Ligand binder design. Structure first.
Ligand SMILES: Nc1ncnc2c1ncn2[C@@H]1O[C@H](COP(=O)(O)OP(=O)(O)O)[C@@H](O)[C@H]1O
Ligand SMILES: [Mn+2]
Ligand SMILES: [Mn+2]
Length: 287
């Protein structure tokens, strides 16, 4: 890409490993001038096979986003056979990590959903579709802020290409129209958000115990998933609104920000530090 840079160690220092994605490794790093800690995702292009398309899309999309709800991009650097993607450091854990110690309460679910919705509204307003919304791609800072991550399969709508049709995403969270490879748009992310709402409430998405290939026919054919159990009616209705088989009947992210579930339960993001501290304790006491 046009603004690819070189000699990253002139400006940054690579520190300890903090994550592993699908293809590359993520490290903590630090800006040598401001001493601000950052995250560095390092990709070995020599290892890169047919995932290279996704690396270029990730950098392109990150570089074009400027929102408090999307991992901030600092730049991409070439270093021998590797590519360093430098981004905002988020040290609180992903929403999936934060589910490990135990269930969330409805205030936690509504607060995390509300922040994800602000990220989706930003992306959709930029004509971008994330296409891989799930708890593992929702990252929190150590202080409770919530941001969307992992843009390798994001789609871009344009003035003439008003729909996408590529089969991409993570099966359990994929909308029926994406699985069928029908023309789709940002509403596909609203279906994935409904699945993520169930994931935040139950700890796993519907069908999580089946092989993902099986869900390729269960999803289009079956009735949409619902949330059953001791959950407030508004949370079940928030899930139902998102999980409509007809995309045009799903609400937009902006409309969902005013859903009764969000309005009556979401609280300040700073309260999420209790959840972040629970994961830290949990992880330390872990056998
Ligand atoms: N900005 C970041 N700050 C802190 N940890 C991060 C950051 N980006 C990625 N990670 C760590 O890397 C993991 C996988 O990242 P992701 O973007 O989902 O990678 P991939 O495209 O290689 O699968 C995250 O789930 C997290 O544990
Ligand atoms: Mn991911
Ligand atoms: Mn990715």
């Amino acid at each position: 890409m046009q603004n690819l840079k070189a000699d990253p160690e002139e400006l940054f220092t690579k520190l300890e490993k903090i994550g592993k994605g699908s293809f590359g490794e993520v490290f903590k790093g630090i800006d040598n001038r401001t001493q601000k800690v950052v995250a560095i995702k390092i990709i070995d292009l020599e290892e890169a096979e047919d995932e290279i398309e996704d690396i270029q899309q990730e950098i392109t999309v990150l570089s074009q986003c400027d929102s408090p709800y999307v991992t901030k991009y600092y730049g991409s650097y070439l270093k021998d056979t590797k590519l360093w993607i430098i981004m905002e450091y988020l040290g609180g854990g992903s929403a999936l990590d934060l589910l490990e110690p135990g269930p969330l309460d409805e205030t936690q679910i509504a607060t995390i959903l509300r922040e994800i919705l602000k990220g989706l509204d930003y992306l959709h307003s930029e004509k971008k579709i994330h296409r891989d919304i799930k708890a593992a791609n929702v990252l929190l800072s150590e202080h409770g802020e919530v941001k969307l991550a992992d843009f390798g399969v994001a789609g871009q709508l344009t003035d003439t290409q008003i729909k996408r049709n590529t089969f991409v995403g993570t099966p359990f969270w994929m909308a029926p129209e994406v699985i069928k490879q029908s023309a789709y748009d940002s509403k596909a992310d609203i279906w994935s958000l409904g699945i993520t709402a169930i994931e935040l409430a139950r700890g796993e998405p519907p069908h999580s115990e089946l092989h993902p290939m099986k869900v390729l026919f269960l999803i289009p054919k079956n009735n949409p998933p619902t949330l059953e159990g001791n959950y407030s009616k508004p949370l079940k209705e928030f899930v139902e609104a998102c999980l409509n088989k007809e995309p045009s009947f799903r609400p937009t992210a902006k409309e969902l920000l005013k859903h009764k579930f969000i309005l009556r339960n979401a609280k300040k993001t700073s309260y999420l530090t209790e959840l972040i501290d629970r994961y830290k304790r949990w992880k330390a006491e872990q056998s």
